[PDB]
């Protein structure tokens, strides 16, 4: 079993940044691959980054060049740096976790951004 914690969601204005982070708890050791995804009301998950334990990631288009996931293995921690946020990226923000042999899937409990000016 692995449990997925997330933090660093909220309020912040356009053109600002964020950090989420999502911690990693129980049988970490047996993760293969961490990912970040977003759903705003009435629609589907977007996803938006994906990275290995290698360090290899991949990205959606509609946030490359903005969005950077990393992870610190030490800390089972995945990170995604979510830079010139725009009033589109509101949503709620999740944080997936493939393990034991990519065959299984756990997810976190999600955390709002809200991009406004107020
Ligand atoms: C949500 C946290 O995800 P991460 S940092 O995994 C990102 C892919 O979890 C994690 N923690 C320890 N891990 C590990 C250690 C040794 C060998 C293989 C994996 N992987
Ligand atoms: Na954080």
């Known amino acids: 079993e692995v449990q997925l914690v997330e933090s660093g969601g909220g309020l912040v204005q356009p053109g600002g940044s964020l950090r989420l982070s999502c911690v990693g708890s129980?049988?970490?050791?047996?993760?293969?691959?961490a990912g970040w995804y977003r759903q705003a009301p009435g629609q589907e998950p977007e996803f938006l980054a994906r990275i290995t334990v290698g360090g290899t990631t991949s990205y959606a288009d509609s946030v490359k060049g903005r969005f950077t996931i990393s992870r610190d293995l030490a800390k089972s921690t995945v990170y995604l740096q979510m830079d010139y946020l725009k009033p589109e990226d509101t949503a709620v923000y999740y944080c997936?976790?493939?393990?034991?042999?990519?065959?299984?899937?756990?997810w976190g409990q999600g955390t709002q951004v809200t991009v406004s000016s107020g």
């Open positions: 129980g049988r970490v050791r047996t993760i293969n691959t």
């Open positions: 997936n976790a493939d393990f034991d042999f990519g065959s299984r899937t756990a």
